[PDB]
Amino acid sequence: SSVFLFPPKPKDTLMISRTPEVTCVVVDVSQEDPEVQFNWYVDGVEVHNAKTKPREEQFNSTYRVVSVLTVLHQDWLNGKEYKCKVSNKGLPSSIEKTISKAKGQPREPQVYTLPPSQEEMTKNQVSLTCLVKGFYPSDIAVEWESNGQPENNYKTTPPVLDSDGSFFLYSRLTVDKSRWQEGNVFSCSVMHEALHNHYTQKSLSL
Amino acid sequence: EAAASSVFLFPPKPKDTLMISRTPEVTCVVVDVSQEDPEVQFNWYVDGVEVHNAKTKPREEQFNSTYRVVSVLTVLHQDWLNGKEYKCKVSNKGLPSSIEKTISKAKGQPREPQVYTLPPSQEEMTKNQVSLTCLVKGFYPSDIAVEWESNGQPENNYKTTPPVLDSDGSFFLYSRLTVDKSRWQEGNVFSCSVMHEALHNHYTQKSLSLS
Ligand SMILES: *[C@@H]1O[C@H](CO[C@@H]2O[C@@H](C)[C@@H](O)[C@@H](O)[C@@H]2O)[C@@H](O[C@@H]2O[C@H](CO)[C@@H](O[C@@H]3O[C@H](CO[C@H]4O[C@H](CO)[C@@H](O)[C@H](O)[C@@H]4O[C@@H]4O[C@H](CO)[C@@H](O[C@@H]5O[C@H](CO)[C@H](O)[C@H](O)[C@H]5O)[C@H](O)[C@H]4NC(C)=O)[C@@H](O)[C@H](O[C@H]4O[C@H](CO)[C@@H](O)[C@H](O)[C@@H]4O[C@@H]4O[C@H](CO)[C@@H](O)[C@H](O)[C@H]4NC(C)=O)[C@@H]3O)[C@H](O)[C@H]2NC(C)=O)[C@H](O)[C@H]1NC(C)=O
Ligand SMILES: *[C@@H]1O[C@H](CO)[C@@H](O[C@@H]2O[C@H](CO)[C@@H](O[C@@H]3O[C@H](CO[C@H]4O[C@H](CO)[C@@H](O)[C@H](O)[C@@H]4O[C@@H]4O[C@H](CO)[C@@H](O[C@@H]5O[C@H](CO)[C@H](O)[C@H](O)[C@H]5O)[C@H](O)[C@H]4NC(C)=O)[C@@H](O)[C@H](O[C@H]4O[C@H](CO)[C@@H](O)[C@H](O)[C@@H]4O[C@@H]4O[C@H](CO)[C@@H](O)[C@H](O)[C@H]4NC(C)=O)[C@@H]3O)[C@H](O)[C@H]2NC(C)=O)[C@H](O)[C@H]1NC(C)=O
């Protein structure tokens, strides 16, 4: 049996309208194993409002179990520690995993958009780049849109630790050259705790 | 199984395999070695043939009451890039069991990286330092090295993202060099150098200056 503990999604912690939660996952549960149980703690204080799903077989003939705990936004953002403790009913062993927001003064992401290189302009598709740098902690969401509508054809690097202790990443949106040369307006939007309203967006066009 | 999981085998650095004057090494590491354990021994094999030039370091104590033992094998650049398999077999002296790990370069047709340089965003130009960006894309395997230079000298205030798997099965990454706005303003030429097995002479460079 092996245990994984996952943080809330950056968008959830940052929107008053959304609900952040932490997720505790147990794999390699033998069909023989007694009921997998969860005890959840917030800064050492046990809480009882988690939601556990029955075990589910996997493509390797093992079972998997998932417990979800809703968190308060300010609790997560204030650096509270979430601990999941996993055991089997009537056995003594336990495994504990903990997760919390990185500690340290939050720092505002600097967001810059970059057009395609002239050398790439010879191709049928071109790259639109959004540099996001100087942010702390690394929890962040980056999306693209055009003329107000979500664009999907992008990939974003993981946050990378910079020499000054902040993070940066790049997001690359691929578009048809014709759409770029038509003058369409593309936008990068970034959500982060150290932004006003937790949100900023920057435009990019020819 | 707890035994199998305490041997790790690491590849050489991408830059070391691409220049025959550098020294690419495969590294076999055994952790959780006990003080009650006889000497940790290594046998190394290249495509199943035993080689004898590895260098094994004495056990080094870790701050968790265990020892780590490392063996380092120098590899021929051409062997690694041609896909030979490297095997490390670990045993304890006087006992018969062993644990084997194998590594080799990623399989798949290599693909040449396209390298583009991008100047700072006009909005960044109001700052004291600006970002010069190198976009490297379309490459395979993901083994790659990127560095920046100017006027002969390595520039070293730069950081590079890990490769990211793209939809077509190739990789891309970005490297960001940070430089005083003044040095960009003065018309200094900055260059992004890229080393990858699918590049002619394993190396290409692209430069950027104020325009
Ligand atoms: C007691 O302590 C020891 C020592 O740790 C140290 O001391 C303690 C007290 C602490 O202070 C601790 O923080 C200190 O580090 C503990 O030893 C550790 O044991 C764990 C396992 O229990 C090992 O975990 C693996 O880590 C691998 C990555 O290791 C590298 O990166 C970490 C940092 O992220 C470093 O700390 C490591 O040292 C490794 O660093 C690399 O080392 C290479 C060899 O030197 C370097 O390459 C060489 O570099 C030189 C120049 O320097 C030349 O260039 C050479 O040419 C080159 O070869 C390399 O640069 C360097 N990198 C970096 C960034 O530093 C993980 O890869 C590995 O994950 C695999 O296995 C997992 C299973 O455990 C699995 O979950 C993973 O998914 C992954 O699985 C693999 O995946 C691939 C494909 O995805 C598959 O093909 C594989 O088959 C698959 N393998 C599987 C499934 O097995 C592990 O997480 C850890 O490495 C080790 N530390 C050290 C220092 O040895 C010990 O555990 C403690 N014991 C107890 C009881 O507490
Ligand atoms: C049988 O088949 C099973 C299914 O295929 C298989 O189960 C897998 O077992 C693996 C090992 O036993 C296990 O591997 C781990 O994976 C960790 C990351 O997992 C995520 O990403 C995977 C893709 O890489 C996905 O497949 C996973 O499902 C998981 O995906 C995430 O899922 C969560 C929860 O559902 C989700 O979060 C929630 O999303 C919802 C949306 O509905 C909400 O928004 C919630 O609010 C939100 O919380 C994520 O979005 C989702 N993400 C993604 C990207 O999909 C990986 O991190 C583990 O590595 C760590 O631990 C190992 C040691 O075990 C270390 O070696 C390794 O280096 C990592 O070390 C950690 O590093 C951290 C620092 O960054 C540090 O903090 C940790 O302490 C440290 N841990 C250490 C040192 O131990 C690990 O490799 C895999 O996830 C299982 N897959 C599934 C689907 O469960 C089973 O093994 C098979 N049996 C066999 C083969 O015998």
Author numbering:
A (entry chain A): 238 to 443
B (entry chain B): 234 to 444
Copied sentences from the primary study:
The Fc region of the immunoglobulin (IgG) antibody, which is the focus of this study, can have interactions with Fc gamma receptors (FcγR) and first subcomponent of the C1 complex (C1q) that mediate antibody-dependent cellular cytotoxicity (ADCC), complement-dependent cytotoxicity (CDC), antibody-dependent cellular phagocytosis (ADCP), induction of secretion of mediators, endocytosis of opsonized particles, as well as modulation of tissue and serum half-life through interaction with the neonatal Fc receptor (FcRn). We describe here the functional and structural characteristics of three novel silent Fc designs: huIgG1 sigma (IgG1σ), which is a variant of huIgG1, and huIgG4 sigma1 (IgG4σ1) and huIgG4 sigma2 (IgG4σ2), which are variants of huIgG4. To assess the impact of the silencing mutations on the structure of the Fc, crystal structures of the Fc fragments of huIgG1σ, huIgG4σ1, and huIgG4σ2 were determined to resolutions of 1.90 Å, 1.90 Å, and 1.85 Å, respectively. Crystal structures and simulations of these Fc variants reveal altered conformational preferences within the lower hinge and BC and FG loops relative to wild-type IgG, providing a structural rationalization for diminished Fc receptor engagement.
